[PDB]
Structures are given as C-alpha cells and as structure tokens.
C-alpha cells in the first residue's frame, strides 16, 4: 500500500541540571531506523534498522551535523518560547516537532506534514498547502512572523517534495523484504467466566505488522462499539504488534457474537467465534 516517513524531535529543558536535551528519531511506517541523543557520550545519528546500515560516511556525517546544529537551535527556541509565555526560569518545558511525507503505491507524494507542540499543546503547524501556517495563539504568531520573514515554508516544501520523497523510496527498496512485507495477525478467542450470569470473550491478534488493525465484536451482526473494551495496540519487541478486544456476554448467548479482524496482511477479513 502507501507509506510514510516521519522524524520526531523532542527538546526538553531541565534548569539546574545542565542544558536542554535534544532527541531525534526517524521512522518509516512503524519501523524506527535512526536516532540521535545530545546526552550520548559521543552524540551522532546512529542506525536502528539493518537496511540503513549500508548508508555511507557522507550520510552519517550530514545527519549528525544537522542534529548537533539542531541541539543548539532548539535550546535557543526553548529560551524564546519561555519569553513568549512570560514563564519563569525555573520550570522545565518541551518543544516537540513531527514532520515527514506520505507517498502512495507509485511513490508519489500524497501530502507533507510539519507540526510543533509546546508542553504537549498544539503550537504551530504548516498547512497542507505547504505554503501557509496555523498558529495556535499569540505566542505562536510571533514564531509565524519570524518564519514568514525567513521564508521557512518554502524550505520545508522543498524538503517535503524533494528529499523526503526520494529518500523514502530509497529506504523502501533497500528494506523491501521487511518494510514492504505485511504480516497478518494470528488470532484466537478466549472465554473467561465472570459469574453464573456472564463471561468475557476476548479476541486476540498477535504477530502483525504494520500496527494498523481493526478488531470489532458484533452481536447478531451489530457492532458492540460502546460495549467493547479495546486495548491500545502494543509492540511485541520483534517489530510486530499485539491487540485485543473484549466483550461481556450473557452465559448461553456466546454464539450470537462474532469477532471481525481487518489487517492488510490478510487475504480477506476474518470472522471468529468462540469454539469451546
């Protein structure tokens, strides 16, 4: 199907405990492939997936230099935003940024993203036109005027339509045996009695990649949305993900319930029931 590349920047101040820490991680779809940590004994952009290891010295040196520059730029930016909100020098604050591109099955740009947050709240976002800005408040308006004056959107657009798309296509080819392989969920249904009156049916999915999945319970063919305990999809540690959905049913009505599973690894969607 379609694919994404994203970089996630976290910049965190810590007054009294040194200068602010800057972390960058890069992903293709749900696969992390690089990291940088300004707290590391020797800070550098480092591989976190096997298919990136073949990149040469120019790549690692460029990505390391930009990240080290970013460490300084984000430190100044944290000082700036503290001023914009009249905040004390004693508190710890966070700038987060995520940017990247989505491409379709033919590798064509579907859209680009660049969004920032400050202490967990929307701060400023590049619009889908990759030309204009949305500032969340009068503090972010100061950033917006700085960035318009510097023609930042034009630089972000060049990257999002240029390098981001080109390198994503390159990564997808170098890592095709994993990045372009969908592993279907292994599924099963369990039955845990609660009382003489009801029991829990839990519908499991294990070992799937990527993380996107749809698990739903129906009773007499009707989705039990309000009645389904959905757990957050979770990583197994081997690149794959796990998920379950649970519904509480009256004893003896178990056969009126079906679990439905949609995942791009699956030849066709799955319908499951409890098999005692």
């Amino acid at each position: 199907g379609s694919h994404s590349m994203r970089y996630f920047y976290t910049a965190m101040s810590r007054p009294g405990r040194g200068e602010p820490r800057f972390i960058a991680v890069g992903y293709v779809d749900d696969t992390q492939f690089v990291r940088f940590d300004s707290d590391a004994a020797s800070p550098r952009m480092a591989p976190r997936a096997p298919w990136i290891e073949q990149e040469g010295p120019e790549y690692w040196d460029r990505n390391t230099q930009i990240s080290k520059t970013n460490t300084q730029t984000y430190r100044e930016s944290l000082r700036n935003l503290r001023g914009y909100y009249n905040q004390s020098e004693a508190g710890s604050h966070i700038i987060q940024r995520m940017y990247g591109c989505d491409v379709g099955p033919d590798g064509r740009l579907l859209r680009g993203y660049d969004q920032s947050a400050y202490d967990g709240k929307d701060y400023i976002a590049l619009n889908e036109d990759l030309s204009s800005w949305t500032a969340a408040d009068t503090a972010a308006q100061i950033t917006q005027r700085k960035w318009e004056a510097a023609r930042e959107a034009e630089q972000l657009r060049a990257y999002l339509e240029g390098l981001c798309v080109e390198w994503l296509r390159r990564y997808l080819e170098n890592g095709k045996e994993t990045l372009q392989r969908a592993d279907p969920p292994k599924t099963h249904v369990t039955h845990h009695p609660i009382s003489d009156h009801e029991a829990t049916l839990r519908c499991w999915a294990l070992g799937f990649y990527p993380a996107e999945i749809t698990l739903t319970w129906q009773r007499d063919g009707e989705d039990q949305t309000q009645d389904t305990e959905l757990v957050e999809t979770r990583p197994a540690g081997d690149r794959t993900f796990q998920k379950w959905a649970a519904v509480v049913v009256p004893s003896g009505e178990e056969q009126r319930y079906t679990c439905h599973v949609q995942h791009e690894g699956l030849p066709k969607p799955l319908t499951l029931r409890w098999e005692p």
């Binding site: 952009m45 990505n63 730029t73 700036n80």
Partner: peptide, 9 residues
C-alpha cells in the same frame, strides 16, 4: 534523511 536545520522559533 533529516531536513536541513531550520530557523529558531
């Protein structure tokens, strides 16, 4: 690959 280092906020 990462985007070139941009302007401070």
């Amino acid at each position: 690959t990462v985007r070139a280092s941009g302007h401070s906020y």
